Amino acid sequence: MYVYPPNVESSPELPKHIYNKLDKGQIIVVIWVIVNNDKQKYTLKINHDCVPEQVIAEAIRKKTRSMLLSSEQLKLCVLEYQGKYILKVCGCDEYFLEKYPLSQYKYIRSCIMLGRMPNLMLMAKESLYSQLP
Numbered sequence: 001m002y003v004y005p006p007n008v009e010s011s012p013e014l015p016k017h018i019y020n021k022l023d024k025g026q027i028i029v030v031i032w033v034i035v036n037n038d039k040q041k042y043t044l045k046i047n048h049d050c051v052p053e054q055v056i057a058e059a060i061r062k063k064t065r066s067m068l069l070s071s072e073q074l075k076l077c078v079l080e081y082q083g084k085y086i087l088k089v090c091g092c093d094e095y096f097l098e099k100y101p102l103s104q105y106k107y108i109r110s111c112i113m114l115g116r117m118p119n120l121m122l123m124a125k126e127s128l129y130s131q132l133p
């Protein structure tokens with residue numbers, strides 16, 4: 001269980017041809033989760049420069065929407081749960097573990113260029129843990 005550094009570009013600035021493909025600075029992503037090992041997903045529209053914990057936070061917003069939480073109650077729940085999970089590129093041993101604008105990760109910036117939908121798996125942070133020798 002080696003964990004590799006984040007696969008990011010050298011600058012958060014988007015090249016001209018990629019910047020002009022944003023829809024009012026926003027992108028759409030699909031977030032998968034294992035629930036039986038059944039799968040559920042969210043399709044979320046987010047600012048391109050959201051950091052991975054803000055993506056997990058938006059999914060927390062969607063999950064608790066029916067509770068009619070106030071902004072303070074949502075902040076409390078987000079601070080409690082957003083650190084217990086991590087985002088992983090579907091089908092690849094690559095994680096978004098560090099605070100970078102999402103579009104600075106090479107997988108996301110490639111999805112924006114090619115017009116492809118980013119697919120990410122939200123997983124428990126403990127699955128990264130290696131046992132001690």
Ligand SMILES: CC(C)(C)OC(=O)NCCOCCOc1ccccc1-c1nnc(Nc2ccc(CC(N)=O)cc2F)c2ccsc12
Binds near residue numbers: 035059
């Ligand atoms: C924020 C906390 C941690 C309190 O929310 C949970 O306990 N989540 C559930 C456990 O999954 C653990 C990880 O889940 C999350 C953790 C953080 C943010 C969002 C989720 C999340 N939750 N549900 C998702 N779909 C989903 C719909 C309906 C059901 C059936 C049902 N009647 O519950 C089950 C489902 F799974 C999806 C789909 C994509 S992300 C996501």
